[PDB]
Amino acid sequence: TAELHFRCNEGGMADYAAQLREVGTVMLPAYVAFDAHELARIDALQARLPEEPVHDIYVRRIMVDRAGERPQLVNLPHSETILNLLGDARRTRFFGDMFGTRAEYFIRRCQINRMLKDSFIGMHLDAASNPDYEFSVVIQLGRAFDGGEFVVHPQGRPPNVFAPAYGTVIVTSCAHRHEVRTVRANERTSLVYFYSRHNGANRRAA
């Protein structure tokens, strides 16, 4: 009956980490985390990747993280170039502060999701793929679309609704169920990746 809609956080690091802490999700405005020319590069690079259906959602894998296995680079060489940006010193410091820990974090899984009109992502928990995922990061590469809100459903709270634009970045804790609502026009393209302090094998049973 009631849903809490969020705009991009207009503050700084102290504000970003506090919203992630209290709310569990924060949306950063373009182009704080990744500069526009960097997103332009990522966009040119991901196009070169092989696409597979997963048919109203098409997925371009960069890094896979199968049950019982350790994270694996795939679709070389352009996957690694994208990953190099995601894990460079600027981003490592940026998300290190964002998460509020000195501990080393690893990017375990990473892919481009291309969602066509009338696609959606039903309710789920990222922890179900890997119980050690702590945070998820989503970069919006979709130039223009309707619908497609990223919705988080924390236990005993109103849903938190995020409408993302090109260049925005959502950071969210994997402790909350979440979903993407129906895409209502053109297509919605996002780079999604997952952070864990564990770099060993995925403890989800295969």
Instruction: For residue 71, count other CB atoms closer than 10 A to its CB.
Output: 22
Instruction: For residue 102, count other CB atoms closer than 10 A to its CB.
Output: 6
SS (H, E, C) 173-194: ECCCEEEECCECCCEEEEEEEE
Instruction: Tell me: is residue 153 an annotated ligand-binding position.
Output: no
Nearest to 131 by CA among 201, 59, 61: 201
Q: Which is nearer to Fe ion, 38 or 179 (CB)?
A: 179
Partner in contact with 54, chosen from Cl ion, Fe ion, none, beta carbon below 5 to 8 Å by kind: none
Partner in contact with 35, chosen from Cl ion, Fe ion, none, beta carbon below 5 to 8 Å by kind: Cl ion
Q: Which is nearer to Fe ion, 1 or 155 (CB)?
A: 155
Residue 38 Cβ vs Cl ion, minimum distance, rounded to whole Å: 8
CA separation for the pair 27, 20 (Å, rounded): 9
User: Dmax over Cα atoms in the chain, in whole Å?
Assistant: 48
Instruction: Tell me: is residue 124 an annotated ligand-binding position.
Output: yes
Sign of CA dihedral 152, 153, 156, 159: positive
Task: Answer for the pair 170, 25: CB distance below 8 angstroms, yes or no.
Answer: yes
Q: Which is nearer to Cl ion, 45 or 63 (CB)?
A: 45
134 binds Fe ion (CB under 5 A): no
Using CB under 5 A, which of 36, 44, 125, 185 touches Cl ion?
36
Using CB under 5 A, which of 17, 35, 78, 120 touches Cl ion?
35
Query: Which residues in 151-180 contact Fe ion (CB under 5 A)?
Result: none
Using CB under 5 A, which of 24, 62, 126, 169 touches Fe ion?
126
Task: Answer for the pair 161, 24: CB distance below 8 angstroms, yes or no.
Answer: no
Residue 41 Cβ vs Cl ion, minimum distance, rounded to whole Å: 12
Q: Which residues in this chain contact Fe ion in the complex, by CB under 5 A?
A: 126
Q: Which residues in this chain contact Cl ion in the complex, by CB under 5 A?
A: 31, 35-36
Annotated binding site for Fe(3+): 124, 126, 178
